[PDB]
Design a protein around this ligand. Structure first.
Ligand code: ADP
Ligand code: MG
Length: 77
DNA sequence: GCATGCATGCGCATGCATGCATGCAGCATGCATGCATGCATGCGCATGCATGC
């Protein structure tokens, strides 16, 4: 504890053009991969992207890696 | 003086601008049904955790 790892993650997420900062249990399930929603404007079925889909061609920053679910860890794998 | 003919008022029918109610119909408004739509309910099922042994 207290060696400034999280500050480094915050900094590296501020320097990258595309980069997302997420914490262990606050981003679980469809908040990582994708979700099914209906588009209000075009009346079509879309897929909403999660953190991993927002950081495509970028850097993803995950904090408290040890606390995540097994399902979330499979996706990272 | 006397005989005559025209203008003026009296008497009689008729038409006609106002005005208003009633029965019938034409006419538009409000109502009943019927349905499309998207949201929220509540309900069993699978997963991840906290507890006991
Ligand atoms: N080497 C360091 N240099 C500067 N600040 C540090 C250093 N180590 C820790 N800190 C400070 O101490 C705190 C550590 O918080 P954090 O980044 O969450 O540490 P950790 O990731 O280990 O939990 C922050 O305020 C950070 O600025
Ligand atoms: Mg930390």
């Amino acid at each position: 504890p207290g060696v400034a790892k999280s500050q480094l993650l915050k900094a590296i997420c501020k320097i990258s053009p595309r980069g997302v900062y997420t914490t262990g249990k606050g981003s679980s399930g469809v908040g990582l991969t994708a979700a099914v929603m209906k588009d209000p404007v075009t009346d079509e079925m879309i897929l909403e992207g999660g953190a991993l889909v927002l950081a495509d061609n970028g850097i993803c920053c995950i904090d408290e890696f040890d606390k995540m679910d097994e399902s979330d860890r499979t996706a990272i794998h």
